[PDB]
Amino acid sequence: VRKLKHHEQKLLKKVDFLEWKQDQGHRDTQVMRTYHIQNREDYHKYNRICGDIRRLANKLSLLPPTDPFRRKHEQLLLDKLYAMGVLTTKSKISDLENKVTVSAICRRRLPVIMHRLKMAETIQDAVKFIEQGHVRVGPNLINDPAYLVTRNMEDYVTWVDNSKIKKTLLRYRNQIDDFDFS
Amino acid sequence: TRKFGLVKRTLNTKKDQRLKKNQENLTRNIPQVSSALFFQYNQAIKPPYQVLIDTNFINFSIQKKVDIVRGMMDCLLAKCNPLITDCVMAELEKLGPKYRIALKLARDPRIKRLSCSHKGTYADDCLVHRVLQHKCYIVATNDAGLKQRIRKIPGIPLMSVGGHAYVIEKLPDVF
Amino acid sequence: IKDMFSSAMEVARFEGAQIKTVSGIRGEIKRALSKPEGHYRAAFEDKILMSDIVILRSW
Amino acid sequence: AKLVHDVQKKQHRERSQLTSRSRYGFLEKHKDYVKRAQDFHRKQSTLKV
Amino acid sequence: GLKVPKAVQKELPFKSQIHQMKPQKKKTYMAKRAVVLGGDEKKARSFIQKVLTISKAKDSKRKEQKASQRKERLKKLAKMEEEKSQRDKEKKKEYFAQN
Amino acid sequence: GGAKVVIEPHRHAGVYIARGKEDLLVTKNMAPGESVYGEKRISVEEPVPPTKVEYRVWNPFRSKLAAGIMGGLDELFIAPGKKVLYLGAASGTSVSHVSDVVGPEGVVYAVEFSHRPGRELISMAKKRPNIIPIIEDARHPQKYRMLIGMVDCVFADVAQPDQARIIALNSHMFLKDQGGVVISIKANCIDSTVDAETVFAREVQKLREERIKPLEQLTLEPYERDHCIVVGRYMRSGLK
Amino acid sequence: GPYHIKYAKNGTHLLITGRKGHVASMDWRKGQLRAELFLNETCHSATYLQNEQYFAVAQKKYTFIYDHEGTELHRLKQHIEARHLDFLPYHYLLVTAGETGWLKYHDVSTG
Amino acid sequence: SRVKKRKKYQKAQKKLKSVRAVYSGGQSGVYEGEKTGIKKGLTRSVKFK
Amino acid sequence: DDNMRREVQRDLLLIKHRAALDPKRHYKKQRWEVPERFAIGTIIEDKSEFYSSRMNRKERKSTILETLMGDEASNKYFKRKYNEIQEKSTSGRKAHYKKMKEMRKKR
Amino acid sequence: DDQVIGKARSRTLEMRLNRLSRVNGHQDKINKLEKVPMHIRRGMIDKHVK
Ligand SMILES: [Zn+2]
């Protein structure tokens, strides 16, 4: 912590007060900084599900390469994860080990969907807006940031009517019709 | 009256300078080509020449039975001063007790000797550095890599054991 | 295109022929116009200009 | 020029607009047309974007 | 210039909107107020403008001439590298054919 | 001749560049209002009213150190608070420029052996108080070891064949560890039987034999034929 | 909640933990607090490590390790349910026991 | 054959002013200045090892 | 200060664009942005040598710009070079386009 | 194959791919060892040789 001299750094090399090997390079912290994750245990709650997908993918690739059970369940899991939005392509089954990843499950969260739909300028702005209760999917208002938005369910991410944000974008283009409140 | 999007403060491996990989928190230098040189001529060197030897040149001299100073003299037809750097001498001593003949032929009062000031005994690095610094040196060598380095840097004549006598290449006044 | 032919019979004789401007814009003559006699309608690779000359290379 | 004569790689000179057709100035040739066409194509490309 | 149509440019995204400012038709007060100096100052202005456009056109001439230099150096350099790579891929086959 | 320039600080601290249509290497003037060897001066009015302070043009054809500066040396050790031991202060030509680069808070010990140059050195060191003129032979540093203590850079403009021994003796007496050693080597005055690169290589080898690690050499060719400046530092332990 | 108290081994710093979430490391004899962090899960105990500069807190399940100003340095994936932490200062060992029937010694220096 | 080597040596020693800096003969008249510029960032000196 | 930079702001432009003041001078390629600390100074040629570098009392000026404006050969070169740059820059833009259209229209 | 269940299948396929790729692939690139520390790889080797 004091920038050890040469004899000290030679004499105690494995000493590190910040980065440990159980930390795994602080990647929970790293991807929760990237996608602005509030609570500490969401990374590991997603890591359990990525481990489920990859455990099944291992145990399913250990079946013989031609039997219809392996082919049906590999294709069925691939279709389910593409439809949910974690996987970005349902083509190859090496996605079920390589491209299945806590960052993919985190890119499917509601503020990241928002920021990619240009509905907020950054992920922290999207977090603030859906905490303030501006965003509804479908009819019903969504209030928490961790909400996972599937591919067919991202067509209905809008703002609530009577939103001040909806009002100011309509009045920026002065398409505001005050009959329907905005 | 709290703040929105509240997070738990963790450390930033991209930013925190307390950890080691983030401890990394103009004047150009174009060295002029030497005033000893014409385009590729080296118009300034003149006899008495001085020639930097290395270890495989000495080994090939003894394997071909050429004397060092007399082979240099009847190669260049000029008076030569041969120079063993301390790293070439270190390399000959490190070659072991098989090369005792070569070591005590390099120990010769007619062969003068320089004093290199660096760590390690890499004679190719030392010869290349002290020849591209100064351009007043002939390099006598038989290493293929050192021969390619020396004949790529300009204005430096290169001597080598070929056949039963020494040959010289980048010296344009040999006859 | 105005005057390389004197009659719609002549253009009818030469229909479908490939022409080109002096800019190398390739083209094809398509149909003789009705009322101005040697005038016809051609289609080109893109928009030719009013300062061009079309060319029917014959032998 | 390995086996070419200098009287063979001469300079062919380019022709002018006909004097009867002179109010439409400057009969344009293939370099002028490509300067026209690639300008039109880059502007249509950014319009399509 | 590129004349993007109004029907397209009214329906553009917020990042892609085209900042086109209208000309001024009214003799505004700051423009009718603001003083310009004359005589030696207007010939100083003329001189500085002439010097700056001569400097800019000289720089444009120099960089265009360097572009014409380095495209033909690229051409001869690529020819010499192609000849070199041909020599390498035949010397490698010689080496392996002997060994 | 009556024109106007803009003064601008150089990379090297204590020296400046005056940009006009020909730009000049320039130093501040320690004794304002007179020229020492007929160089031209620049008088700025810096802002009690503003005061007229002035500057002196450093002539590279009459100064090996200015030829080195404007050929481009990566590090001079002559700096604005330092102590320089000038060896071979042949007149007050370059010693005045070294003196006012070094400034009022630093000291230049100007060692010269001849006596009419010494008389001109003393009359120049009157109006430049930061010059200690020492009229003595530099080949015997013990004869003036009492007058000088612990210099920071030695500059050597001696033109004698026992140059490296003079530089080594004066450095071992008065230079401090990791201090500067700036040498102006003249090939023809060392010896003319060998070429210039041979004598520069031998002098650099002599310096590292007397444990002065060379950092840099510069030929300073458009101003002097067959000259050199070798800039080294006095390592005193471990050139390796 | 009820505050588990802890002092540094020289009496300069105080480390309190609320049962609810409130962990505060402070210089109790000046008026200087240097970490006040509200970790909204039920914390149980804390201790300093070799200094006021690092402290370990035993949270809902996992033991966490925080620096001087309160940024989280480590989440220990072992030490599954600690209720008792104690540092061994000459050996640099954080010792951990709790609702599991396991006792875990963790080297703080190497990690 | 003689005038060709007279005029390819004049070309060569005009190119030599580009690569090195050639000693032209010293100070001609009054020291006018550097006449071409002074770069305070470039150091054209050979560093050791 | 900016109050003095607004007085020496023109000859700093002249020193920045040195390279196109004389057609025979041809400086070495630097950029020379305006330095943060500078000082404008006047050369004292002393009272030792006369007539060679001596700019007399009757032609000493107060900027570099007044000297360049008083030079009459530089005024010839700047006016000539500016007119040829001008007629190169207006070569085929709009007066040419509308005189081509009027050429079409006249007949 | 079409009847070989897990760990036999993974190591069998890996052995076949190694044996096919050892002809044209480089010898410093085909058989990469798993990175094991020095003082435990040497103990692994000593116990295996025992
Ligand atoms: Zn060596």
> What string of DSSP letters covers B114-154?
----SSS--HHHHHHHHHHTT---EEE---HHHHHHHHHST
Do the chains contact at A16 and G111, CB–CB below 8 Å? Answer: yes
**CA-based nearest residue in chain F for residue I59:** F2
**CB half-sphere exposure, A71, CA atoms < 13 A:** 6
Residue I31 contacts H where some CB pair is shorter than 8 Å:
no
Residue B7 contacts A where some CB pair is shorter than 8 Å:
yes
Residues 1-49 of D with CB under 8 A from C: 17-18, 21, 24-30, 32-33, 37, 40
Chain F residues inside the 8 Å CB shell of I11: 4, 6
CA B52, CA B72: separation in Å to the nearest integer? 11
Taking any CB pair shorter than 8 Å as contact, residues of chain I touching chain E are 10, 13-14, 17, 19-21, 65, 68-69, 78-79, 81-82, 85
B82 upstream amide cis, omega within 30 of 0? no
CA E18, CA E9: separation in Å to the nearest integer? 7
Six token digits for residue B21: 């990989």
Strand B49-53 relative to strand B138-140: parallel, antiparallel, unpaired?
A: parallel
Q: In what order do the strands lie in the sheet with C54-55?
A: C40-44, C26-32, C18-21, C54-55
CA F6, CA I33: separation in Å to the nearest integer? 13
Å from CA of H48 to ligand 1 middle? 13
CA G23, CA G17: separation in Å to the nearest integer? 4
Taking any CB pair shorter than 8 Å as contact, residues of chain H touching chain I are 29-30, 32, 35-37, 39
Chain E residues inside the 8 Å CB shell of D47: 2, 4, 8
Which experimental method was this entry solved with?
Answer: cryo-EM
Nearest in space to F108 (alpha carbons), one of F117, F120, F95, F121: F95
Å from CA of B128 to ligand 1 middle? 10
Residue F154 contacts H where some CB pair is shorter than 8 Å:
no
Q: In what order do the strands lie in the sheet with G22-27?
A: G4-7, G14-17, G22-27, G32-38
Do the chains contact at A28 and G75, CB–CB below 8 Å? Answer: yes
Query: Count H helices, E strands: chain G?
Result: 0, 11
Cβ-Cβ contacts under 8 Å between A and G: the total is: 29
Nearest by CB to residue J10, choosing from A62, A66, A67, is A62
Nearest in space to B36 (alpha carbons), one of B170, B173, B154, B158: B154
CA A14, CA A11: separation in Å to the nearest integer? 9
Residue A141 contacts G where some CB pair is shorter than 8 Å:
no
Contact (CB, 8 A) for G99 and G83? yes
Read off φ and ψ for residue F230, nearest 5 degrees. Answer: -110, 120
H or E element, residue I105: helix I95-106
Six token digits for residue G14: 């105080």
Q: Partners for J (CB, 8 Å, 3+ pairs)? A: A
Contact (CB, 8 A) for A70 and J6? no
Give the three-state DSSP class for E6.
helix
Strand F213-218 relative to strand H46-47: parallel, antiparallel, unpaired?
A: antiparallel
Strand F131-135 relative to strand C26-32: parallel, antiparallel, unpaired?
A: unpaired
Contact (CB, 8 A) for C27 and C21? yes
Q: Which residue pairs, CB below 8 angstroms and at least 24 apart, start in A111-114?
A: A111/A35, A111/A36, A111/A145, A112/A35, A113/A149, A113/A154, A113/A157, A114/A157
Contact (CB, 8 A) for F113 and F91? no
For chain H, what's the residue count? Answer: 49
Nearest in space to F70 (alpha carbons), one of H40, A115, G105: H40
CA distance D8 to chain I (A): 35
Read off φ and ψ for residue C54, nearest 5 degrees. Answer: -90, 160
Residue E4 contacts D where some CB pair is shorter than 8 Å:
yes
CA distance I85 to chain F (A): 24
CA G14, CA G35: separation in Å to the nearest integer? 11
Contact (CB, 8 A) for F153 and F83? yes
CA distance C48 to chain D (A): 9
Contact (CB, 8 A) for F71 and F43? no
Contact (CB, 8 A) for B77 and B107? no
Cβ-Cβ contacts under 8 Å between F and H: the total is: 70
CA A38, CA A147: separation in Å to the nearest integer? 12
CA distance I17 to chain E (A): 6
Do the chains contact at I106 and D24, CB–CB below 8 Å? Answer: no
CA I67, CA I75: separation in Å to the nearest integer? 11
Give the three-state DSSP class for F101.
helix
CA distances from A120 to A111, A166, E18, G13 (A): 8, 12, 21, 44
Chain A residues inside the 8 Å CB shell of J2: 64-67
Contact (CB, 8 A) for A124 and A36? yes
Q: Give Rg (Cα) of chain G.
A: 13
CA A105, CA B82: separation in Å to the nearest integer? 73
**CB half-sphere exposure, B71, CA atoms < 13 A:** 25
CA B38, CA B30: separation in Å to the nearest integer? 18
Nearest by CB to residue J2, choosing from A59, A62, A64, is A64
For chain G, what's the residue count? Answer: 111
Do D and J make contact via 3 or more CB pairs under 8 A? The reply is: no
First to last CA, chain G: 31
CA A37, CA E9: separation in Å to the nearest integer? 38
Q: For chain F, where are the E strands, in sequence order? A: 4-9, 15-19, 24-28, 41-46, 51-57, 83-87, 107-112, 131-135, 151-156, 175-186, 213-218, 227-233
Residue A63 contacts J where some CB pair is shorter than 8 Å:
yes
Contact (CB, 8 A) for F87 and F228? no
Do the chains contact at B36 and F221, CB–CB below 8 Å? Answer: no
The b-or-e profile of A4-26 (16+ CB within 10 A means b, else e) is eeeeeeeeeeebbbbbbeebeeb
The sign of the dihedral angle between the CA atoms of A31, A34, A40, A46 is negative
Q: Partners for F (CB, 8 Å, 3+ pairs)? A: B, H, I
Six token digits for residue I47: 């009272």
**CB half-sphere exposure, C47, CA atoms < 13 A:** 7
Chain I residues inside the 8 Å CB shell of H32: 53
| Residues in contact with F92: Cβ distance below 8 Å, sequence separation at least 6, in sequence order | F36, F37, F110, F120, F121, F124, F125
H or E element, residue G48: strand G45-48
Residue D20 contacts I where some CB pair is shorter than 8 Å:
no
Contact (CB, 8 A) for B155 and B36? yes
Do the chains contact at I53 and H37, CB–CB below 8 Å? Answer: no
Contact (CB, 8 A) for G67 and G73? yes
CA G37, CA G44: separation in Å to the nearest integer? 14
H or E element, residue B90: helix B86-94
CA D44, CA E9: separation in Å to the nearest integer? 15
| Other beta carbons within 10 Å of F131 | 26
Per the listing, tokens 């204005």 go with: B155
The DSSP line for J1-50 is --S--HHHHHHHHHHHHHHHHTTTS-HHHHSPPP---HHHHHHHHHHHH-
Read off φ and ψ for residue G57, nearest 5 degrees. Answer: -115, 140
Nearest in space to G33 (alpha carbons), one of G21, G46, G20, G15: G15
Chain J residues inside the 8 Å CB shell of A62: 5-7, 9-10
The b-or-e profile of C26-43 (16+ CB within 10 A means b, else e) is ebebeebeeeebbbbebe
Contact (CB, 8 A) for F219 and B34? yes
Å from CA of I20 to ligand 1 middle? 51
The b-or-e profile of A97-117 (16+ CB within 10 A means b, else e) is eeebbbbbbbbbbbbbbbbee
Q: Exposed, middle or buried by CB within 10 Å (0-12, 13-18, 19+), for D13?
A: exposed
CA distance I26 to chain H (A): 7
CA F153, CA F225: separation in Å to the nearest integer? 26
CA distances from B170 to B46, B56, G25 (A): 14, 20, 76
The resolution in Å comes to 3.7
Chain G residues inside the 8 Å CB shell of A43: none
H41: which DSSP letter?
A: S
For chain F, what's the residue count? Answer: 240
Per the listing, tokens 């790579």 go with: E85
Nearest in space to A154 (alpha carbons), one of A103, A104, A114, A95: A114
Q: Cα angle at B167 between B165 and B173, to 5 degrees? A: 130
CA distances from F57 to F36, G52, H45 (A): 11, 62, 23
CA F174, CA F196: separation in Å to the nearest integer? 30
The DSSP line for I2-58 is HHHHTTSTTHHHHHHTGGGTSTT--------PPPSS-EEEEEE--SSS-SSS---TT
Q: What is the signed CA dihedral for E24, E27, E30, E33, rounded to 10 degrees? A: 150
